[PDB]
Nucleic acid binder design. Structure first.
Lengths: 63, 151
RNA sequence: AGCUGUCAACCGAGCGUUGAUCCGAGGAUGUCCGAAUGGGGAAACCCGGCACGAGUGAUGUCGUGUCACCAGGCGCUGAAUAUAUAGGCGUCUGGGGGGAACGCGGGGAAGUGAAACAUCUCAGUACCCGUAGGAAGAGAAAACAAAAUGUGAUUCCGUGAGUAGUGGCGAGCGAAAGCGGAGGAUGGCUAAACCGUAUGCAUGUGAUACCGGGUAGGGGUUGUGUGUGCGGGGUUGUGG
RNA sequence: CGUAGACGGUGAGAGCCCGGUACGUGAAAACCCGACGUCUGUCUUGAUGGUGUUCCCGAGUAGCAGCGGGCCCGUGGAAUCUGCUGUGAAUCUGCCGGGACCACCCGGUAAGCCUGAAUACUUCCCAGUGACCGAUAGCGGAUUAGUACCGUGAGGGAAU
RNA sequence: AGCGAAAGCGAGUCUGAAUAGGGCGUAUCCACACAAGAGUGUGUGGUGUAGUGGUGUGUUCUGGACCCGAAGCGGAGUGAUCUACCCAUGGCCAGGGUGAAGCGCGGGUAAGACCGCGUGGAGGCCCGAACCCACUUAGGUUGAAGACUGAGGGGAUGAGCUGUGGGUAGGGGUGAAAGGCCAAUCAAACUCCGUGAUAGCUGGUUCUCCCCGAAAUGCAUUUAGGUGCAGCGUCGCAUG
RNA sequence: CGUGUAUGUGCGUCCAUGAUGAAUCAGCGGUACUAACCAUCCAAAACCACCGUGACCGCACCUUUCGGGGUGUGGCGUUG
RNA sequence: AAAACACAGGUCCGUGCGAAGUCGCAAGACGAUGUAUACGGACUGACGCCUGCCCGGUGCUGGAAGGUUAAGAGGACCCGUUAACUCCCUUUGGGGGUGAAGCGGAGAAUUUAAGCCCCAGUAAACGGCGGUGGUAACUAUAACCAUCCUAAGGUAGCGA
RNA sequence: UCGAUACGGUUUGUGUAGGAUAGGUGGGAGACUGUGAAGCUCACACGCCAGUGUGGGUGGAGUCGUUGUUGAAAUACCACUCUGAUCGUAUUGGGCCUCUAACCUCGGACCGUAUAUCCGGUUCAGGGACAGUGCCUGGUGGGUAGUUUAACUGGGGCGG
RNA sequence: GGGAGCUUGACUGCGAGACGGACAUGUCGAGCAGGGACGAAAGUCGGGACUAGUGAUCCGGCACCUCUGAGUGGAAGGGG
């Protein structure tokens, strides 16, 4: 789970750098959690994967 | 999260009381269960919140109140106004559960909520005593009927 | 005025001034396979679902259409659960795949060099992925410069300069400002109160009450915009 | 003869034999590029310039950290630009940028956009060029050429 | 126009409290003087200093860099039609033997245990063809054959053999484990690409003649068959 | 495997002939649902007893000269 | 082609069950349509008599109170610039000391993890498994004299 | 359960002589009581070997007047309450028990769905605010990877 | 070489002409302010009788400096 289904946040790519300065490719994954989002106030909770940024920004609705 | 309550909650306030509670609490318990609303605008979260609190307190149903309200809804025919064509009848708009609820209130009397009427099930596309059902309780239907006239 | 393409001859047939063969532009047909797409499949080969010609005493056959899956729009329908929905049905519109280079965005080596080697280099290379277009990305400064009534979007060339720097300060790496040029083209919207409006709540007490004014009245924008859409009367600094 | 002496062909060095060449002319159709009118929108439902006082001037944003990427800049005193994670501001006495902070001073009004030309390339088509190769050369390929042949395959791959 | 690290100063400048000396500069050269013989200085006066663009040539830098040559490394793919193992579904195993368990009958057993007799026809049972193997031997050893042949030899109802269709794929598979097998290659397959890898190493480097003409030493070296500099060669200038 | 024909049996209905209708208005038992009752059931609060000694101290040491440790002489946090 | 591998049998360890283990980034799969009398792993290797001592080193399994111990919003103090205070010259302005609000640095006290240190287990875990020399230790010999060192000293059995 | 921040109800201060616990400096020194200061068995408990703190019943017109200097003159009275045991709120913290709503469940039942051990919606039942991975962080880490493991040397190694 | 007196010539700061010198390290210091004494005048000293007792560069520390300070003022940083 590295892509947000709302904003499309993909994982960034970079290097993990050691004390000896060996740089080894690693991934900054988004913090996306399984959220049972409620599209309409009705109540049917459809499961999706949303980044914590969207959860904090209120683009998810766990109604 | 700054939000004004719509009902009474413990140490969170009362209906209309503003409080800041953390995002998880608001987002998962309050906004879902309808016990509060985020204060986008102070005047809004005040007046809309108060209206919602009163409306819930007035539209609450009960076990025996369920059958009593079924009896009350078994009164007559309600009527709604929406613009149609010259003869086609293709309504310019479309009935809503809110429309049906308010029409029932203003004509018949009985107070109730949007989680009563089966509006789509009662396709209401033209005019006349198109019937609708208010699901008063777990299994208490009510074929309240609803005429349609020009707006 | 010869032609029936060529290897590529041999014929036997023929065509052509009434205009052939030849050239150019439109069309028509365009088997089967291939994104291949009715289903299947070992590609080009196997099996199927309306109306017509048949093929009759009839089944059997072949001709034409059409029939994949996806998204998106629009109509119905609205399971389990009740307004209400995932989904299902029907119809339109697209997508799919290929292509040598160039573009953009991502992923990203190692040989190699460092006379070893890991930092580093190789190199953001090769390769890989996603995607375009005829070009693409960037583009109309909350910029750059420094006290000059300085320039005034971006891009691309030459310089600045192998300089300043950077660097196990090793191997190496290496700008920018400024300047000279190619080109020139400093358009529109989002905010505000609302003009107006359209539409999703709550009913107070259906009067706040509206054309902005005063001055007649009922039951009016019900009245209150918090939520959006829309033509703005709307819209850059020493301010709209 | 020459506004034609480009180049080729023709039985051997052809301006004058031939296709041509200089120079002229030729589109029914189709396509492209232009204008010319319908047509489309807007402005006219108006243009002018000055005063003083509230709201507006793009938010999960800027900013701040923790880890990275990029810049001459290899983490360095490290600005500016950026990804992921948290934390998270005000709207003009605001906010950034001047490689950290100022009586400062200058640049001005980001967090939403579209924008031609100058630019890169040539699968393909057209017309040409060569102090290019001339059959072991030049394309692997002047012939059958990605053919024959080899390999299960990816692929390799001629000779004439 | 240099000196210095710049406020910088400038034919001077840096160092220095110290006109103390030095460093680096004021092209060069000539005359005059003043000086001191510490190797010559100081001023003064004369002529006025020569770069920079092409371009040839030799070296050199970055590139493949004079040419050929590794084992190997990386990226992306191709291979389980050979082989390893496994999965589905089939097939085969001439002939003989031995004779298990059970199941009956008789002795003994208080009765059982047990012992004989019959039936029974079990076994990774025995002998032995097909089949599958590959122990010994001779031959082949520019073979008939890139692993075979002839004689013998092991298994041969099983952990058997085998057909067909499948699956596992490279730092991976499979392995009754030999580092074995993975398409005649396996201590990391193969093809293409990075790529003309890199190699202080080996080899090769093509016409002529005239002049000169070495070195195999020193020092240093992750150095000792390499290299830097010196030494020694040559060609230009200058001194002679 | 399909078409036409003829007959043989062959059997539909408006019909005909047969089986059944099979539930209603009253009115009972069984699920026994409303609440409550029984059989079983595992517990919280208070409650006691113990192993045990997270707290305490010395009391004895093979002895540090007992003078550091640890177990019994013990009331304890029954702290687990 | 064997003495090697395997083998049936053993023992240890792991595993409470989309187990452990393995292929996978993940989903999922196998394990197994199984269930601790089952699986996976390690070693040994029918069967018979047996597998003696040692937990010191290193693994593993538990944890004894401490100490060490990153990542944080624990942020004293200190440092930059300055509204401003003081004084010197000097007076159409620069020289010292003090310096709030701030914003910008470096940041100490204190602060809790795992691991380590540490205590007990574990040898069918990797691995260990001595002397004395005073005796008649019998001068074929197993014990005995009573001796230092560790954690122990090679026990039965076998042995050119 | 224990923390930290804004104020805070009353004593709490033998300095040295001493009504003798001189409350912090001023107001003080008419400000202090009948529903009610005192000495008191005592309510309530705090010591500097000074006695103390507000008082129910007593008690009743109560203390006081540089009461004598011990400068601060009885804490007998005024502001900040100053060393300071206890303050009650709101903000934010280590930890334990939890209420379920996040999130999780390969536990059940339904429906999409004729087909369905997929998955995903509903619901129930369980976990549960843990776990899961996200960022950052410490440890273990030949499981994998890139590498390095000098030269001289009467060959190399050992030795030097 | 052995003794005493004083003292701190590692003149430190500036430095002679010279010389030892594959490229990367040494000897005198004659002069200058400021010293050391002994002394008395003259006088001598840049650690040692002499040759060993040490390690380039890079990177950073620490002190002082009338050096730079990315718009200006400082500052960070750099430089000597």
């Amino acid at each position: 789970a590295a892509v947000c289904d709302i904003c499309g946040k993909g994982p960034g790519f970079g290097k993990s750098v050691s004390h000896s300065h060996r740089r080894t490719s690693r991934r900054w994954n988004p913090n996306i959690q399984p959220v049972r989002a409620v599209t309409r106030p009705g109540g049917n909770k459809q499961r999706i994967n949303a980044c914590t940024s969207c959860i904090k920004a209120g683009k998810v609705s766990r109604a | 999260m700054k939000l004004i309550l719509t009902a009474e909650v413990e140490h969170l306030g009362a209906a209309g009381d503003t409080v800041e509670v953390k995002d998880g609490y608001g987002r998962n318990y309050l906004l879902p269960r309808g016990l509060a609303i985020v204060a986008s605008r102070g005047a809004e979260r005040q007046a809309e919140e108060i209206r919602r609190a009163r409306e819930s307190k007035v539209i609450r149903d009960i076990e025996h109140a369920n059958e009593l309200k079924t009896a009350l809804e078994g009164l007559g025919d309600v009527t709604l106004s929406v613009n149609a064509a010259g003869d086609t009848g293709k309504l310019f708009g479309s009935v809503t559960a809110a429309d049906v609820v308010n029409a029932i209130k203003k004509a018949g009397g009985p107070n109730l909520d949007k989680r009563t009427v089966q509006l789509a099930k009662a396709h209401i596309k033209s005019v006349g005593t198109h019937p609708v059902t208010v699901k008063l309780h777990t299994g208490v239907e009510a074929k309240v009927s609803l005429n349609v006239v020009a707006q």
